[PDB]
Design a protein around this nucleic acid. Structure first.
Lengths: 72, 62, 143, 72, 189
RNA sequence: ACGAGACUCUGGCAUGCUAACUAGUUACGCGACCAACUUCUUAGAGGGACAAGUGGCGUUCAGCCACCCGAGAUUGAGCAAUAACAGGUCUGUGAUGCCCUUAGAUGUCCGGGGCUGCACGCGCGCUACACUGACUGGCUCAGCGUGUGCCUACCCUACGCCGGCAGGCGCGGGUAACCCGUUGAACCCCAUUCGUGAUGGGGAUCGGGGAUUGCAAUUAUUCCCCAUGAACGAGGAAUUCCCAGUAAGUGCGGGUCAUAAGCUUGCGUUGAUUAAGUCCCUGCCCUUUGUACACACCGCCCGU
């Protein structure tokens, strides 16, 4: 995948999530909650990505909201 | 020109031909607490702390 | 990382007379046939590096470039590097120099005026010869 | 309107400005370029020659601000 | 071992007062090693106020139409030669670092009067954040023009930017422009 | 009872579910010690968000503001009430009511002047200000979509002649998640760089190298290089559009079509200063009031 903000910070999402799954399925839940809490309390933006996407080119204009110049 | 900490009690509204100033009422905490009104600019959120560098600036209303 | 060359307040290459204010080796706009990829290619062919100190650069490299351009057809190097190629009056690309001569020959407008063509007047009036639209946009050329 | 500075390398004048850099509290290419009003590339070459002399260690490189430091 | 950055720490920087954390607030998940946390500061008002003043400072150089918003630029700026200055200072730059900008700040701006008349302005204020960061925005313009067509450039003003960041005393320039306007509009009290 | 909402489509979220020989893989696996009951992509019967929890304002009602939690907390569009207008369309339609010209039928035939002028008569358009603009070619990038017989003779494209690549000719694949193509002369970046701004930094024409092959193109089709130097760094009166993945930059694809775009309709990519307000200008709506207006203020109307 191309895009810095995509694969970067996804490496940290992956390290947190892989650690979570490993400790949950292998050792217990208490160590999971402790270390996962440390990692995802360092920063929040791991588990949540930006939902922002390019929006549709709209009606009678160059883009989504801009409109062609009106004459009188 | 003392520095006094006061809490916003209510947000009145804007003024001007097109609207360019904001009205709040701030109450003191350590100056024999009483209600004083003052106009304000910028994001001064719901019940935040407005700092009075002076106890004499009022808001001329309407 | 030291060089015993001495700073020269006056330097002369091609008899031009222009305001020497900035640095050199890419402000060679006074030199007509050197710079950019061709000069980079020649210098890389000469196997030289950038381990010296900028600011004080002499003119020997560009002299060597013009020297190789004196006989460019011997080595069969890709020959789309000269300015006016496949012109009438010669099947080759000869040498010329000095300013006040090149800017005119950028528009070889003797035979195209002699033939009684619209092209001579299109070129002469400073207007389009290919048809750049000139009523709302396309107003540059005389200001 | 570039200023005129003595750049000639002489038996005497050359060894009078090369031992003036370490006589300042703030000694960086930025400080020299903003204060002594000579090319910062000259200061970069000076620190490169210092690195060649063997009293520092190079870490990273850049077209404006390079990293040369010491741990002794 | 919860020490902020690789050099600072959150265990020795204490004011023994919990009313004066409006400039530096490092006590929770909001603490940032490097400011490239992404995000949108224009989604809602009171969110650019929720900004960390370090991030607002470095990002608000997003002006002209060609250098606008590009977070790679600001992160490279605040990384490059900051990595150098940390090992090149050794001592504490804290004195100037705080003591020019972060209480250079003004104390009043003005607002419009009635319905007409562009000859004087009624003096008001805000809880310090908006006025300090309006001085910061005019200082964005001022530090730019101190670089814009000037000699000291971008990605090398790290000293002055740490000044523009940290905490509490007075030496600035665009802020004294704001203070001239302060007094002029304050003659209406 | 309509309209509004609901609704439909569309985005945004799954240590979940249904499974893929076109994405994706485990120690009796090689071409290498000197046949995972399906999850990234695709798409389905479902789930998820309700102002739901808390705090504060509210005849403690409707609701509003803020805050955790959360993928997401007024979130793109489509559809859209009788009366309306002598609004446009008879040149979209043996959809359709007849007063009525001409033979120079508003039929054909690579056939054929203009409009591709320059004292502008107007309107929509083609364009970024510096270590940010662009080159090192030194790491896996995006689409949204299109693509070949009723008519029909016209499709999208994978190597060499080789000057330096589309390419004049041989060549296969794809009626398509199978081929183009993990989108074949593109990031915005960068050891060609600006030391304080007319230089290297972004192009006033306009000339050659082989031109995709369209009789014509010039009286609209068809590449980058020599660095030849253009008020070379926020703009009469008047103003148009716009509030977050707005604007703007930037390319790409569909329609038109012969791969004909400076147009339009969509799509991604970089990415956003300002504002969470007002009724001052232009208007609109839910009232009260005045009227000598009702063709309704572009009204009506007085005066030698």
């Amino acid at each position: 995948g191309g895009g810095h903000v995509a694969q970067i910070y996804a490496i940290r999402q992956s390290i947190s999530k892989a650690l979570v799954a490993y400790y949950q399925k292998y050792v217990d839940e208490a160590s999971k909650k402790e270390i996962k809490d440390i990692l995802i309390q360092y920063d929040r933006t791991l588990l949540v990505a930006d939902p922002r996407r390019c929006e549709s080119k709209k009606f009678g204009g160059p883009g989504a909201r801009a409109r062609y110049q009106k004459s009188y | 020109q003392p520095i006094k900490l006061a809490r916003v009690t209510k947000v009145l509204g804007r003024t001007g031909s097109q609207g360019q100033c904001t009205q709040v009422r701030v109450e003191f905490m350590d100056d024999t607490s009483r209600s004083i009104i003052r106009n304000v600019k910028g994001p001064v959120r719901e019940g935040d702390v407005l700092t009075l560098l002076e106890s004499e600036r009022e808001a001329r209303r309407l | 990382l030291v060089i015993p060359e001495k700073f020269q307040h006056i330097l002369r290459v091609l008899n031009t007379n222009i305001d020497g204010r900035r640095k050199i080796a890419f402000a060679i706009t006074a030199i007509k046939g050197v710079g950019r990829r061709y000069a980079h290619v020649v210098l890389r062919k000469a196997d030289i590096d950038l381990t010296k100190r900028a600011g004080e650069l002499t003119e020997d490299e560009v002299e060597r470039v013009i020297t190789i351009m004196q006989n460019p057809r011997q080595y069969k190097i890709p020959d789309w590097f000269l300015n006016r190629q496949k012109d009438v009056k010669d099947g080759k690309y000869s040498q010329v120099l000095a300013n006040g001569l090149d800017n005119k020959l950028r528009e070889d407008l003797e035979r195209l005026k002699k033939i009684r063509a619209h092209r001579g007047l299109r070129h002469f009036w400073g207007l389009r010869v290919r048809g750049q639209h000139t009523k709302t946009t396309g107003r540059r050329g005389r200001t | 309107d570039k200023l005129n500075n003595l750049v000639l390398f002489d038996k005497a004048t050359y060894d009078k400005l090369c031992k003036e850099v370490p006589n300042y509290k703030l000694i960086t290419p930025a400080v020299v370029s903003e204060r002594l009003k000579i090319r910062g590339s000259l200061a970069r070459a000076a620190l490169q020659e210092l690195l060649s002399k063997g009293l520092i260690k190079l870490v990273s490189k850049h077209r404006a601000q390079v990293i040369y430091t010491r741990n002794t | 071992d919860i020490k902020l950055f690789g050099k600072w720490s959150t265990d020795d920087v204490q004011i023994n007062d919990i009313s004066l954390q409006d400039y530096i607030a490092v006590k929770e998940k909001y603490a940032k090693y490097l400011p490239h946390s992404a995000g949108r500061y224009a989604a809602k008002r009171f969110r650019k106020a929720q900004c960390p003043i370090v991030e607002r400072l470095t990002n608000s150089m997003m002006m002209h139409g060609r250098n606008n918003g590009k977070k790679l630029m600001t992160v490279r700026i605040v990384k490059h030669a900051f990595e150098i200055i940390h090992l090149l200072t050794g001592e504490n730059p804290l004195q100037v670092l705080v003591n020019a900008i972060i209480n250079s700040g003004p104390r009043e701006d003005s607002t419009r009067i009635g319905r007409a008349g562009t000859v004087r302005r009624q003096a008001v204020d805000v809880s310090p954040l908006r006025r300090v960061n309006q001085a910061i925005w005019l200082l964005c313009t001022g530090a730019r023009e101190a670089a814009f067509r000037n000699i000291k450039t971008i990605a090398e003003c790290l000293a002055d930017e740490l000044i523009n960041a940290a905490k509490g005393s007075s030496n600035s320039y665009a802020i004294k422009k704001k203070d001239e306007l302060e007094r002029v509009a304050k003659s209406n009290r």
